[PDB]
Amino acid sequence: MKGILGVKVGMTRIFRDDRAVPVTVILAGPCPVVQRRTPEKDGYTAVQLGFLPQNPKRVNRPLKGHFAKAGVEPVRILREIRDFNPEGDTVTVEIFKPGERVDVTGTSKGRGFAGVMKRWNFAGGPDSHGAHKIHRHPGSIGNRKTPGRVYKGKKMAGHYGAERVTVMNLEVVDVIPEENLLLVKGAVPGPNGGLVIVRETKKA
Amino acid sequence: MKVRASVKRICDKCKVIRRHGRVYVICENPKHKQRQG
Amino acid sequence: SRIGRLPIPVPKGVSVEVAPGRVKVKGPKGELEVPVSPEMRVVVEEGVVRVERPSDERRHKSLHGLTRTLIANAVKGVSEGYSKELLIKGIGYRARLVGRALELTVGFSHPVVVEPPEGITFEVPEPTRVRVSGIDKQKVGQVAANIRAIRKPSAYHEKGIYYAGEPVRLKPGK
Amino acid sequence: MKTYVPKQVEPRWVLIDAEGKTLGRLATKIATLLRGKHRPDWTPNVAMGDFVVVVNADKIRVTGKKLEQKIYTRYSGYPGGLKKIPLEKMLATHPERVLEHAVKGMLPKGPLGRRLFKRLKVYAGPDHPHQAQRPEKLEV
Amino acid sequence: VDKPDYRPRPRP
RNA sequence: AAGUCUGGGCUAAGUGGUAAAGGAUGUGGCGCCGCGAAGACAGCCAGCUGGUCGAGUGGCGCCGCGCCGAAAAUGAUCGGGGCUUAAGCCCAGCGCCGAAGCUGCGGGUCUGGG
RNA sequence: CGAUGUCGGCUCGUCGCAUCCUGGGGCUGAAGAAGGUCCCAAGGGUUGGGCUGUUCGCCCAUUAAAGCGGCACGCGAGCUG
RNA sequence: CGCUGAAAGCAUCUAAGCGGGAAGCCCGCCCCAAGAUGAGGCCUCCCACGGCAGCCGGUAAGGACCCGGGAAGACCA
Ligand SMILES: [Mg+2]
Ligand SMILES: [Mg+2]
Ligand SMILES: [Mg+2]
Ligand SMILES: [Mg+2]
Ligand SMILES: [Mg+2]
Ligand SMILES: [Mg+2]
Ligand SMILES: [Mg+2]
Ligand SMILES: [Mg+2]
Ligand SMILES: [Mg+2]
Ligand SMILES: [Mg+2]
Ligand SMILES: [Mg+2]
Ligand SMILES: [Mg+2]
Ligand SMILES: [Mg+2]
Ligand SMILES: [Mg+2]
Ligand SMILES: [Mg+2]
Ligand SMILES: [Mg+2]
Ligand SMILES: [Mg+2]
Ligand SMILES: [Mg+2]
Ligand SMILES: [Mg+2]
Ligand SMILES: [Mg+2]
Ligand SMILES: [Mg+2]
Ligand SMILES: [Mg+2]
Ligand SMILES: [Mg+2]
Ligand SMILES: [Mg+2]
Ligand SMILES: [Mg+2]
Ligand SMILES: [Mg+2]
Ligand SMILES: [Mg+2]
Ligand SMILES: [Mg+2]
Ligand SMILES: [Mg+2]
Ligand SMILES: [Mg+2]
Ligand SMILES: [Mg+2]
Ligand SMILES: [Mg+2]
Ligand SMILES: [Mg+2]
Ligand SMILES: [Mg+2]
Ligand SMILES: [Mg+2]
Ligand SMILES: [Mg+2]
Ligand SMILES: [Mg+2]
Ligand SMILES: [Mg+2]
Ligand SMILES: [Mg+2]
Ligand SMILES: [Mg+2]
Ligand SMILES: [Mg+2]
Ligand SMILES: [Mg+2]
Ligand SMILES: [Mg+2]
Ligand SMILES: [Mg+2]
Ligand SMILES: [Mg+2]
Ligand SMILES: [Mg+2]
Ligand SMILES: [Mg+2]
Ligand SMILES: [Mg+2]
Ligand SMILES: [Mg+2]
Ligand SMILES: [Mg+2]
Ligand SMILES: [Mg+2]
Ligand SMILES: [Mg+2]
Ligand SMILES: [Mg+2]
Ligand SMILES: [Mg+2]
Ligand SMILES: [Mg+2]
Ligand SMILES: [Mg+2]
Ligand SMILES: [Mg+2]
Ligand SMILES: [Mg+2]
Ligand SMILES: [Mg+2]
Ligand SMILES: [Mg+2]
Ligand SMILES: [Mg+2]
Ligand SMILES: [Mg+2]
Ligand SMILES: [Mg+2]
Ligand SMILES: [Mg+2]
Ligand SMILES: [Mg+2]
Ligand SMILES: [Mg+2]
Ligand SMILES: [Mg+2]
Ligand SMILES: [Mg+2]
Ligand SMILES: [Mg+2]
Ligand SMILES: [Mg+2]
Ligand SMILES: [Mg+2]
Ligand SMILES: [Mg+2]
Ligand SMILES: [Mg+2]
Ligand SMILES: [Mg+2]
Ligand SMILES: [Mg+2]
Ligand SMILES: [Mg+2]
Ligand SMILES: [Mg+2]
Ligand SMILES: [Mg+2]
Ligand SMILES: [Mg+2]
Ligand SMILES: [Mg+2]
Ligand SMILES: [Mg+2]
Ligand SMILES: [Mg+2]
Ligand SMILES: [Mg+2]
Ligand SMILES: [Mg+2]
Ligand SMILES: [Mg+2]
Ligand SMILES: [Mg+2]
Ligand SMILES: [Mg+2]
Ligand SMILES: [Mg+2]
Ligand SMILES: [Mg+2]
Ligand SMILES: [Mg+2]
Ligand SMILES: [Mg+2]
Ligand SMILES: [Mg+2]
Ligand SMILES: [Mg+2]
Ligand SMILES: [Mg+2]
Ligand SMILES: [Mg+2]
Ligand SMILES: [Mg+2]
Ligand SMILES: [Mg+2]
Ligand SMILES: [Mg+2]
Ligand SMILES: [Mg+2]
Ligand SMILES: [Mg+2]
Ligand SMILES: [Mg+2]
Ligand SMILES: [Mg+2]
Ligand SMILES: [Mg+2]
Ligand SMILES: [Mg+2]
Ligand SMILES: [Mg+2]
Ligand SMILES: [Mg+2]
Ligand SMILES: [Mg+2]
Ligand SMILES: [Mg+2]
Ligand SMILES: [Mg+2]
Ligand SMILES: [Mg+2]
Ligand SMILES: [Mg+2]
Ligand SMILES: [Mg+2]
Ligand SMILES: [Mg+2]
Ligand SMILES: [Mg+2]
Ligand SMILES: [Mg+2]
Ligand SMILES: [Mg+2]
Ligand SMILES: [Mg+2]
Ligand SMILES: [Mg+2]
Ligand SMILES: [Mg+2]
Ligand SMILES: [Mg+2]
Ligand SMILES: [Mg+2]
Ligand SMILES: [Mg+2]
Ligand SMILES: [Mg+2]
Ligand SMILES: [Mg+2]
Ligand SMILES: [Mg+2]
Ligand SMILES: [Mg+2]
Ligand SMILES: [Mg+2]
Ligand SMILES: [Zn+2]
């Protein structure tokens, strides 16, 4: 298992064998390891990666301490990759060669308070034939005296989006190491400027 | 396999055995194979 | 009318050591341990092993014959050893060895390669006969059944993998 | 005269090798110890039982076909959320729960009953972290 | 299945 | 709250802890015949008879306890945990616990006798 | 009966399994292919139309299949009427 | 569906034991999650305050308040 932190930058299609291929450009490199999690110390195996340089004017003392013990520039984001232990002291996009399939995790766009139709793809109500102020309402939510309650988990309106999402087995279309880009085929959770994690795929 | 509440010997070569808390009837003739239930 | 109390001839020269709940049978072809009911008492006489039961109720009688045969089979295993033969019948159907492994060509879109486990040796005389041989009688029997399972005897045609000494009973086609 | 009520005394620590003991018939004694009903100054409205350390809980023993037939159950509140877990598997995954569930069901329900359950330290494997308390070996 | 009303429709 | 009480026995289904015709080499205990050291039943060598094996073997019925027959709708469960020479079932005992019943002590009121 | 709103549709499900499909089996009067019949299995799935207020049913075109039931004949302080 | 195998000299998938075997069951995938009061773990920072497991008062590291905003959002976060 291997991975890297990065930000989503935007989308385009490129041309490859007389085919248009939709891609999302991701700026992944470079990520310095700032701690390693070891079975004798932490009980499991992982690498705390750092990402994007930070103004030391903004980094406080307990945070400064952590970085220095690793001999690392103050960074804006700290995040682990599990069961990944790079030989180096620095992880770059080059751990990914084109053709590899990857798993991309990001923070989905937040729809805020979302109705039952947007959230759960409900049918809502009729727009004529007598429909009374129920055009986007969720219908029945239960039975009667038996069971006399509503199920835990009942799909209802409420906040939607702004949550961890992983899309899986995306193709690595190209990688441009001189600019720390990764080119992934298809769509990736979240907005431009959104932090994303890129891990080798778990599919086979 | 036949599944019945009455499993009986059908031919002279049928055999009532009991396996795993269940009465079967096995035999050389496949049609005669029975399981109680 | 009895198996457990009928004594077990031991050939010159295999040894039978007796431990609580097990007996170890070492012989010319190898060794193999036999787990025995701690209720049964196995006895080491001259050129012979005997099994005695501690009562005449159902459970003890049932273990008795079992225990005797378990050891008798173990004895023959390390001296003569065991084997089972497989006849391969059907036109395109054939078998061959590839190293220790056995390769069945029995009418699929592919060949099947059966690897032999420990204690098991494969032989192919004709392309239509296979010998599974080893000192563990239950293990040989197992693997033999395994090989046969790859392509059981058809019910309509004299075609497939057969046990040696397995009768070809068929039913009419249309 | 009014009945004697004890002031707070130093609670005893206790060690038990669960190895080879029958699940239920051990649980019972642990519970009694937990309630302090072996003590002549027993009082039902305070915790004055022993602390009970149990080792080799993975080697608790059980009769009949309960290893594959005894079902532990958990309802989640969600539709279809009844989980069934056999004895065999509980031992294979969380063996200490086996003995823990047993004792728990034999302690009183209520706040005190929950506190007594807390004084039950159960481990799979011969060792335990409580040599600090130096608990007295009990044969049961 | 069509069975008959036991309760009238609610009036003002 | 009071027995992990005593003695004999059955049950291996968690039966106990939800049901019927009916089916069954489940288990234990009675009973009756058939056959056989003139060699029976099983196996192996022949034609219901033969040969070496050297013992028992086959059928009928009754009694106890269990097995199947046994599918329904929110989450399961004998009240729960948990129980297997029992914490189940049958028979026989000793002891305890247990109510506002009975006793002891004190009080009230009515009724009756003083 | 000092009120437990009543069929059908819509919306939203959820459970059962006596299983319509898909998966796994045994027997077959199972050559193959395709069926029958019984067993195991409730994870998922189980279409769009014409007629009728209809539930149901019949019919059209498909489909792996176009399952049967419980939930106050689920669901009118959710809509319809 | 078998292997080995008695009780029952045979036979028997079973009584000892061992294999094979479902879209189903447990793990595995994705998401939530230590109020998991059983409140876990690692890294790092502060520190040894003045007054009579308590109180009051100033601080440390840190936090909040306020403000400019935000593919975050009903307010809050
Ligand atoms: Mg290119
Ligand atoms: Mg590790
Ligand atoms: Mg680990
Ligand atoms: Mg690793
Ligand atoms: Mg993140
Ligand atoms: Mg809107
Ligand atoms: Mg919308
Ligand atoms: Mg949506
Ligand atoms: Mg609609
Ligand atoms: Mg609409
Ligand atoms: Mg209207
Ligand atoms: Mg209106
Ligand atoms: Mg409107
Ligand atoms: Mg209502
Ligand atoms: Mg309710
Ligand atoms: Mg949010
Ligand atoms: Mg998601
Ligand atoms: Mg992940
Ligand atoms: Mg693909
Ligand atoms: Mg693809
Ligand atoms: Mg049948
Ligand atoms: Mg019949
Ligand atoms: Mg007959
Ligand atoms: Mg089985
Ligand atoms: Mg037979
Ligand atoms: Mg004899
Ligand atoms: Mg075979
Ligand atoms: Mg054979
Ligand atoms: Mg013919
Ligand atoms: Mg014990
Ligand atoms: Mg016991
Ligand atoms: Mg005690
Ligand atoms: Mg035991
Ligand atoms: Mg068991
Ligand atoms: Mg569920
Ligand atoms: Mg579900
Ligand atoms: Mg359910
Ligand atoms: Mg689920
Ligand atoms: Mg669940
Ligand atoms: Mg209470
Ligand atoms: Mg009105
Ligand atoms: Mg006793
Ligand atoms: Mg049963
Ligand atoms: Mg029960
Ligand atoms: Mg029951
Ligand atoms: Mg009956
Ligand atoms: Mg009969
Ligand atoms: Mg009997
Ligand atoms: Mg009987
Ligand atoms: Mg004879
Ligand atoms: Mg049953
Ligand atoms: Mg069923
Ligand atoms: Mg029910
Ligand atoms: Mg007794
Ligand atoms: Mg009175
Ligand atoms: Mg008085
Ligand atoms: Mg009076
Ligand atoms: Mg007077
Ligand atoms: Mg009324
Ligand atoms: Mg009213
Ligand atoms: Mg009323
Ligand atoms: Mg309609
Ligand atoms: Mg509607
Ligand atoms: Mg409508
Ligand atoms: Mg509609
Ligand atoms: Mg429901
Ligand atoms: Mg449904
Ligand atoms: Mg329904
Ligand atoms: Mg039916
Ligand atoms: Mg149909
Ligand atoms: Mg099928
Ligand atoms: Mg099917
Ligand atoms: Mg079939
Ligand atoms: Mg066919
Ligand atoms: Mg045909
Ligand atoms: Mg077949
Ligand atoms: Mg045909
Ligand atoms: Mg039929
Ligand atoms: Mg049918
Ligand atoms: Mg049917
Ligand atoms: Mg079924
Ligand atoms: Mg299903
Ligand atoms: Mg379900
Ligand atoms: Mg359904
Ligand atoms: Mg339609
Ligand atoms: Mg029209
Ligand atoms: Mg219509
Ligand atoms: Mg209609
Ligand atoms: Mg009809
Ligand atoms: Mg009609
Ligand atoms: Mg008509
Ligand atoms: Mg078909
Ligand atoms: Mg239709
Ligand atoms: Mg139909
Ligand atoms: Mg339905
Ligand atoms: Mg209904
Ligand atoms: Mg009704
Ligand atoms: Mg209704
Ligand atoms: Mg309806
Ligand atoms: Mg209603
Ligand atoms: Mg209304
Ligand atoms: Mg209505
Ligand atoms: Mg209401
Ligand atoms: Mg509504
Ligand atoms: Mg066979
Ligand atoms: Mg055999
Ligand atoms: Mg034999
Ligand atoms: Mg077995
Ligand atoms: Mg048994
Ligand atoms: Mg198996
Ligand atoms: Mg096999
Ligand atoms: Mg699938
Ligand atoms: Mg998380
Ligand atoms: Mg946490
Ligand atoms: Mg915490
Ligand atoms: Mg956490
Ligand atoms: Mg808890
Ligand atoms: Mg704590
Ligand atoms: Mg913490
Ligand atoms: Mg840290
Ligand atoms: Mg200081
Ligand atoms: Mg001072
Ligand atoms: Mg400051
Ligand atoms: Mg702000
Ligand atoms: Mg937003
Ligand atoms: Mg704002
Ligand atoms: Mg405000
Ligand atoms: Zn037959």
CSV table of N, CA and C (backbone and C1' of nucleotides) in Angstrom, one decimal, chain D residues 24-25 28 37 63 65-66 69-70 73 75 80 82 101-102 105-106, chain F residues 1-2 4 12-14 74-76 80-87:
chain,number,residue,atom,x,y,z
D,24,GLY,N,-20.6,-21.7,33.5
D,24,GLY,CA,-21.6,-21.3,34.4
D,24,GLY,C,-21.3,-21.5,35.9
D,25,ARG,N,-20.7,-22.6,36.2
D,25,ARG,CA,-20.5,-23.0,37.5
D,25,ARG,C,-19.3,-22.2,38.2
D,28,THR,N,-21.0,-18.2,38.7
D,28,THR,CA,-21.8,-18.1,39.9
D,28,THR,C,-20.9,-17.7,41.1
D,37,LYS,N,-20.9,-11.5,49.3
D,37,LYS,CA,-21.9,-12.3,50.1
D,37,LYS,C,-21.1,-13.5,50.8
D,63,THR,N,-20.1,-27.8,28.5
D,63,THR,CA,-20.6,-29.2,28.2
D,63,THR,C,-21.6,-29.2,27.0
D,65,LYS,N,-23.3,-29.5,23.3
D,65,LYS,CA,-22.9,-29.1,21.9
D,65,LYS,C,-22.9,-27.6,21.9
D,66,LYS,N,-22.8,-26.9,23.0
D,66,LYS,CA,-22.9,-25.5,23.2
D,66,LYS,C,-21.8,-24.7,22.4
D,69,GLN,N,-23.7,-24.3,19.3
D,69,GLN,CA,-25.1,-24.1,19.4
D,69,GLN,C,-25.5,-22.9,20.2
D,70,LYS,N,-24.6,-22.6,21.2
D,70,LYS,CA,-24.9,-21.4,22.0
D,70,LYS,C,-24.7,-20.1,21.3
D,73,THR,N,-26.1,-12.8,21.2
D,73,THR,CA,-27.0,-12.0,20.4
D,73,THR,C,-26.8,-10.4,20.6
D,75,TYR,N,-28.5,-6.7,19.2
D,75,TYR,CA,-29.4,-5.9,18.4
D,75,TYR,C,-28.9,-4.4,18.3
D,80,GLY,N,-33.2,-5.2,10.6
D,80,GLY,CA,-32.3,-6.3,10.4
D,80,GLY,C,-31.1,-6.4,11.2
D,82,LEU,N,-30.0,-7.6,14.0
D,82,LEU,CA,-29.8,-8.6,15.0
D,82,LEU,C,-28.7,-9.5,14.6
D,101,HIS,N,-19.8,-12.1,29.9
D,101,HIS,CA,-21.2,-12.0,29.7
D,101,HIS,C,-21.9,-12.9,30.7
D,102,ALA,N,-21.3,-14.0,31.1
D,102,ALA,CA,-21.8,-14.9,32.0
D,102,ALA,C,-22.0,-14.3,33.4
D,105,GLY,N,-24.6,-11.3,33.7
D,105,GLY,CA,-26.0,-11.7,33.7
D,105,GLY,C,-26.5,-12.2,35.1
D,106,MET,N,-25.5,-12.5,35.9
D,106,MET,CA,-25.7,-13.1,37.3
D,106,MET,C,-25.5,-12.0,38.4
F,1,A,P,-30.3,-13.8,48.1
F,1,A,O5',-31.4,-14.2,49.1
F,1,A,C5',-31.2,-13.9,50.5
F,1,A,C4',-32.2,-14.7,51.3
F,1,A,C3',-32.0,-16.2,51.3
F,1,A,O3',-31.1,-16.7,52.2
F,1,A,C1',-34.3,-15.7,50.8
F,2,A,P,-29.7,-17.3,51.7
F,2,A,O5',-29.9,-18.9,52.0
F,2,A,C5',-30.3,-19.3,53.3
F,2,A,C4',-31.2,-20.5,53.2
F,2,A,C3',-30.6,-21.7,52.4
F,2,A,O3',-29.8,-22.5,53.1
F,2,A,C1',-32.8,-21.2,51.7
F,4,U,P,-24.9,-25.6,49.5
F,4,U,O5',-23.9,-26.1,48.4
F,4,U,C5',-23.9,-25.6,47.1
F,4,U,C4',-24.5,-26.5,46.1
F,4,U,C3',-23.6,-27.7,45.7
F,4,U,O3',-24.4,-28.8,45.4
F,4,U,C1',-24.1,-26.5,43.8
F,12,A,P,-30.4,-40.6,24.8
F,12,A,O5',-29.6,-39.3,24.5
F,12,A,C5',-29.9,-38.4,23.4
F,12,A,C4',-29.0,-37.2,23.3
F,12,A,C3',-27.5,-37.5,22.8
F,12,A,O3',-27.1,-36.4,22.1
F,12,A,C1',-27.5,-36.5,25.0
F,13,A,P,-27.5,-36.3,20.5
F,13,A,O5',-29.0,-35.7,20.5
F,13,A,C5',-29.2,-34.4,20.9
F,13,A,C4',-30.7,-34.1,20.7
F,13,A,C3',-31.0,-32.6,20.9
F,13,A,O3',-30.8,-31.8,19.7
F,13,A,C1',-32.2,-33.8,22.4
F,14,G,P,-30.1,-30.4,19.9
F,14,G,O5',-30.7,-29.8,21.2
F,14,G,C5',-30.0,-29.4,22.3
F,14,G,C4',-30.9,-29.0,23.5
F,14,G,C3',-31.5,-27.6,23.4
F,14,G,O3',-32.8,-27.7,24.0
F,14,G,C1',-30.3,-27.8,25.4
F,74,U,P,-43.1,-8.2,12.1
F,74,U,O5',-41.8,-7.4,12.4
F,74,U,C5',-40.9,-6.9,11.5
F,74,U,C4',-39.8,-6.1,12.1
F,74,U,C3',-38.9,-6.8,13.1
F,74,U,O3',-37.6,-6.2,13.1
F,74,U,C1',-40.1,-5.2,14.3
F,75,G,P,-36.3,-6.8,12.4
F,75,G,O5',-35.8,-7.8,13.5
F,75,G,C5',-35.0,-7.4,14.6
F,75,G,C4',-34.8,-8.5,15.6
F,75,G,C3',-36.1,-9.1,16.1
F,75,G,O3',-35.8,-10.5,16.4
F,75,G,C1',-34.9,-8.3,17.9
F,76,A,P,-36.2,-11.7,15.4
F,76,A,O5',-35.5,-12.9,16.1
F,76,A,C5',-36.0,-13.3,17.4
F,76,A,C4',-34.9,-13.5,18.4
F,76,A,C3',-35.2,-14.3,19.6
F,76,A,O3',-35.1,-15.7,19.4
F,76,A,C1',-34.0,-12.4,20.2
F,80,G,P,-36.1,-17.0,29.8
F,80,G,O5',-34.8,-16.1,30.2
F,80,G,C5',-34.6,-14.9,29.5
F,80,G,C4',-33.5,-14.1,30.2
F,80,G,C3',-32.1,-14.7,30.2
F,80,G,O3',-31.4,-14.6,29.0
F,80,G,C1',-32.7,-14.0,32.4
F,81,G,P,-30.4,-15.7,28.5
F,81,G,O5',-29.3,-15.7,29.6
F,81,G,C5',-28.3,-14.7,29.6
F,81,G,C4',-27.5,-14.7,30.9
F,81,G,C3',-26.5,-15.8,31.1
F,81,G,O3',-25.3,-15.6,30.5
F,81,G,C1',-27.8,-15.5,33.1
F,82,G,P,-24.7,-16.6,29.4
F,82,G,O5',-24.8,-18.0,30.1
F,82,G,C5',-23.8,-18.5,31.0
F,82,G,C4',-24.3,-19.3,32.1
F,82,G,C3',-24.5,-20.8,31.8
F,82,G,O3',-23.3,-21.6,32.0
F,82,G,C1',-26.5,-20.0,32.6
F,83,C,P,-23.1,-23.0,31.4
F,83,C,O5',-24.2,-23.9,32.1
F,83,C,C5',-23.9,-24.3,33.5
F,83,C,C4',-25.1,-25.2,34.0
F,83,C,C3',-25.1,-26.6,33.3
F,83,C,O3',-24.2,-27.5,34.0
F,83,C,C1',-27.3,-25.6,33.4
F,84,U,P,-23.1,-28.2,33.1
F,84,U,O5',-23.7,-29.6,32.7
F,84,U,C5',-24.6,-30.3,33.5
F,84,U,C4',-25.0,-31.6,33.0
F,84,U,C3',-23.9,-32.5,32.4
F,84,U,O3',-24.2,-33.9,32.7
F,84,U,C1',-25.5,-32.1,30.7
F,85,U,P,-23.1,-34.9,33.1
F,85,U,O5',-23.7,-35.6,34.4
F,85,U,C5',-24.8,-36.5,34.4
F,85,U,C4',-24.8,-37.4,35.6
F,85,U,C3',-24.5,-36.7,36.9
F,85,U,O3',-25.5,-35.9,37.4
F,85,U,C1',-23.4,-38.8,36.7
F,86,A,P,-25.4,-35.1,38.8
F,86,A,O5',-24.8,-33.7,38.3
F,86,A,C5',-25.1,-33.1,37.1
F,86,A,C4',-25.8,-31.8,37.2
F,86,A,C3',-27.0,-31.7,38.1
F,86,A,O3',-27.3,-30.4,38.4
F,86,A,C1',-27.7,-31.7,35.9
F,87,A,P,-27.0,-29.8,39.9
F,87,A,O5',-27.9,-28.6,40.1
F,87,A,C5',-29.3,-28.8,40.2
F,87,A,C4',-30.1,-27.9,39.2
F,87,A,C3',-30.2,-28.4,37.8
F,87,A,O3',-31.5,-28.0,37.3
F,87,A,C1',-29.2,-26.2,37.8
